[PDB]
């Protein structure tokens, strides 16, 4: 059985592209992320999503943007996509000025908190570290 | 009623606890691979099967190159976390 994907609109694709971090955080510039953001924009444009690219958001701006998006009327949209490109650690993505819990972002879209997305797929695509372990592989 | 946590999918670039890798010229391994597999298979495959192709692409076609030996020749597996209740097709 399959999600209904023939609403008038596929839905939003929100891309948060964090490249440059405040020096006080100690985090490196994320060379290559602009390539990712443009790749994602074109890929989801071809899938007929309404793509919104956002660059270098603070932690406060990430939360405000997600809150605002979850308060839109998604009744005519099939799905919702959010792509996060940043530094991270387990359970956390970074604004340009510090961390935000991933759960705080995704809770805005809970089935009881975003009623016009209840029953619809909510996709979160997360390019960010989840700790400091390295995988040495096996031949 | 349905669970309030139902119908979410979290497509993580890497396994819990691990670094995720990014190429300065080509972008992150995961997003490179995700965009490539969506371009090739969004009209053919269900979304979890597309993401499984992404897992295989990241796992087999990438290995880190670093002047720092402690960060050299490392690998990555993405991590699909599905609370979806239905199959997801991007095609009609």
């Amino acid at each position: 059985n399959s999600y209904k994907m023939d609403y008038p609109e596929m839905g939003l694709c929100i891309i948060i592209n964090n490249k440059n971090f405040h020096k006080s955080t100690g985090m490196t510039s994320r060379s290559g992320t602009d390539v990712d953001a443009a790749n994602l924009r074109e890929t989801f444009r071809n899938l007929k999503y309404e793509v919104r690219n956002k660059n270098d958001l603070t932690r406060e701006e990430i939360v405000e943007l997600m809150r605002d998006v979850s308060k839109e009327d998604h009744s005519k949209r099939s799905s919702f996509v959010c792509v996060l490109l940043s530094h991270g650690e387990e359970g956390i993505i970074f604004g340009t000025n510090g961390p935000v819990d991933l759960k705080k972002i995704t809770n805005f879209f809970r089935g009881d908190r975003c009623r016009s997305l209840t029953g619809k797929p909510k996709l979160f695509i997360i390019q960010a570290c989840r700790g400091t372990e390295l995988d040495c592989g096996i031949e | 009623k349905i669970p309030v946590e139902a119908d979410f999918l979290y497509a993580y670039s890497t396994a819990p606890g691990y670094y995720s890798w990014r190429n300065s010229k080509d972008g992150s391994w995961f997003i490179q691979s995700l965009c490539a597999m969506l371009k090739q298979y969004a009209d053919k495959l269900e979304f979890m099967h597309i993401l499984t192709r992404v897992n295989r692409k990241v796992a087999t076609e990438f290995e880190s190159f670093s002047f720092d030996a402690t960060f050299h020749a490392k690998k990555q597996i993405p991590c699909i976390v599905s609370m979806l209740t239905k199959e997801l097709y991007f095609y009609h």
Binding site: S86, H87, Q127 | R22
Partner: peptide, 5 residues
């Protein structure tokens, strides 16, 4: 080169 996130 490759960098970690």
């Amino acid at each position: 080169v490759d960098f970690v996130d």
